[PDB]
Amino acid sequence: KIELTFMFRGQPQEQTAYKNVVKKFEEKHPNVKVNIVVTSPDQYATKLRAAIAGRKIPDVFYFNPGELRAYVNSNVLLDITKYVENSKGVNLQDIWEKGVNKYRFDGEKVGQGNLYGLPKDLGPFALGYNKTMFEKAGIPLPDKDKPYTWQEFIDVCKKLTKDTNGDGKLDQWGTGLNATWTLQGFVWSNGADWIDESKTKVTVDDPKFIEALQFFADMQNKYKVTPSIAEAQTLDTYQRWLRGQLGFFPVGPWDLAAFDQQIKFEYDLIPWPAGSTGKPATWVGSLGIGVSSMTKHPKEAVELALYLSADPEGQKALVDQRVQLPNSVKVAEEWAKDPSIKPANKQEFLDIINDYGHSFPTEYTYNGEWYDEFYRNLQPVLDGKMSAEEYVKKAKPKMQKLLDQAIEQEKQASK
Ligand SMILES: OC[C@@H]1O[C@@H](OC[C@@H]2O[C@@H](OC[C@@H]3O[C@@H](OC[C@@H]4O[C@@H](OC[C@@H]5O[C@@H](OC[C@@H]6O[C@@H](O)[C@H](O)[C@H]6O)[C@H](O)[C@H]5O)[C@H](O)[C@H]4O)[C@H](O)[C@H]3O)[C@H](O)[C@H]2O)[C@H](O)[C@H]1O
Ligand SMILES: [Ca+2]
In the chain, the amino acid numbered 320 is: D
Q: What is the dihedral of CA 381, 382, 383, 386, to 10 degrees?
A: 10
Strand ranges of the sheet holding 123-124, from the earlier edge strand across to the other edge: 123-124, 282-285, 357-358
Q: Please work out whether the CB of residue 372 comes within 6 Å of at least one atom of ligand 1.
A: no
Q: Please work out whether the CB of residue 250 comes within 6 Å of at least one atom of ligand 1.
A: yes
Quickly count: other Cβ atoms within 10 Å of residue 35's Cβ.
12
Quickly count: other Cβ atoms within 10 Å of residue 185's Cβ.
29
Helix (H) / strand (E) element for 330: namely helix 329-337
Query: Quick one: CA dihedral 401, 396, 189, 232, positive or negative?
Result: positive
Q: Please work out whether the CB of residue 15 comes within 6 Å of at least one atom of ligand 1.
A: no
List of residues 6+ apart from 199 with CB closer than 8 A: 361, 364, 365
Question: From the alpha carbon of 239, which atom of ligand 1 is closest?
Answer: 9
Beta strand pairing call for 126-130 and 267-270: antiparallel
List of residues 6+ apart from 393 with CB closer than 8 A: 205
In the chain, the amino acid numbered 254 is: W
Orientation of helix 388-413 relative to helix 207-221, angle to 10°:
120
Cα(179) to centroid(ligand 2), Å: 26
User: What is the number of domains present in the chain?
Assistant: 1
Q: Please work out whether the CB of residue 135 comes within 6 Å of at least one atom of ligand 1.
A: no
Name the residue of 98, 226, 287 to mutate for ligand 1: max ligand atoms within 8 A of Cβ.
287
Q: Please work out whether the CB of residue 117 comes within 6 Å of at least one atom of ligand 1.
A: no
Cα(245) to centroid(ligand 2), Å: 11
Domain that holds residue 71: 1-415
Q: Please work out whether the CB of residue 254 comes within 6 Å of at least one atom of ligand 1.
A: yes
Q: Give the environment of ion ligand 2: residues with CB less than 5 A.
A: 163, 165, 167, 169, 171
In angstroms, how far is CA 387 from the centroid of its own chain? Answer: 27
- Which residue intervals of 172-277 are DSSP H helices? 179-189, 207-221, 229-234, 237-242, 256-262
Beta strand pairing call for 282-285 and 357-358: parallel
Orientation of helix 298-309 relative to helix 312-320, angle to 10°:
50
Cα(298) to centroid(ligand 1), Å: 31
> What is the three-state SS of 94-112?
HECHHHHHCCEECCCCECC
How many angstroms separate the CA atoms of 252 and 122, rounded? 10
How many angstroms separate the CA atoms of 86 and 97, rounded? 19
Q: What experimental approach yielded this model?
A: X-ray
Q: What is the dihedral of CA 375, 377, 379, 383, to 10 degrees?
A: -130
Is 169 annotated among the ligand-binding residues?
Answer: yes
Listed in order, strand segments (DSSP E) in 272-407 are 282-285, 288-291, 357-358
Strand ranges of the sheet holding 288-291, from the earlier edge strand across to the other edge: 32-39, 2-9, 60-63, 288-291, 118-119
How many angstroms separate the CA atoms of 333 and 326, rounded? 9
Whether the link from the prior residue into 207 is cis, omega within 30° of 0, is no
How many angstroms separate the CA atoms of 17 and 21, rounded? 6
Q: Please work out whether the CB of residue 178 comes within 6 Å of at least one atom of ligand 1.
A: yes
> Minimal CA–CA distance to 154: which of 213, 239, 218, 214?
218
Helix (H) / strand (E) element for 224: namely none
